[PDB]
Amino acid sequence: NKFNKEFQNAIYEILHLPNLNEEQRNAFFQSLKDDPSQSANLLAEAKKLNDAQAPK
Amino acid sequence: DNKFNKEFSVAGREIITLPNLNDPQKKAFIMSLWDDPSQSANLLAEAKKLNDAQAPK
Numbered sequence: 322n323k324f325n326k327e328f329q330n331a332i333y334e335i336l337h338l339p340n341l342n343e344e345q346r347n348a349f350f351q352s353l354k355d356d357p358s359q360s361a362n363l364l365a366e367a368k369k370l371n372d373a374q375a376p377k
Numbered sequence: 378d379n380k381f382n383k384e385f386s387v388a389g390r391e392i393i394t395l396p397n398l399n400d401p402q403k404k405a406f407i408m409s410l411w412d413d414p415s416q417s418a419n420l421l422a423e424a425k426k427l428n429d430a431q432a433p434k
Contacts, residue, residue: 324408332411333404336389343386351381 328357331364338367340374385410388417392424397431 335341335349349367353360392398392406406424410417 329404329408333393333407336386336393336407346386347381347383350383350385354379354381 325357325360327360327364328353331360331367334364335367338371340371340376341367342374345370382414384417385414388414388421391421395424395428397428397433398424399431402427 331353332350335346335353338346341349345367349363352363389407389410392410393403395403398406402424406420410420
């Protein structure tokens with residue numbers, strides 16, 4: 322538990338989300354590295370993107 | 378030194394979809410991989426052996 326909870330959760334959940342493409346995942350991970358304070362914003366963004374990309 | 382190494386996404390997706398790991402195991406492998414993605418082959422081999430050892434019987 323040395324990591325910030327929101328940081329670790331964003332990494333795990335962005336890896337877990339099934340409807341992100343690979344480029345989107347990699348972009349979220351680079352953004353997390355760029356600015357870890359943005360972890361909760363980035364997770365919320367990734368979840369909205371995931372839900373917008375469910376197969377029809 | 379802050380560039381993201383996309384090897385993390387590839388090996389990370391392989392670990393996180395191993396069906397028999399528990400959540401603490403997945404999370405610890407993933408954070409180890411995040412800290413050094415160059416270790417992907419070693420971590421995947423460890424994770425896959427654990428996944429087998431914990432397969433349903």
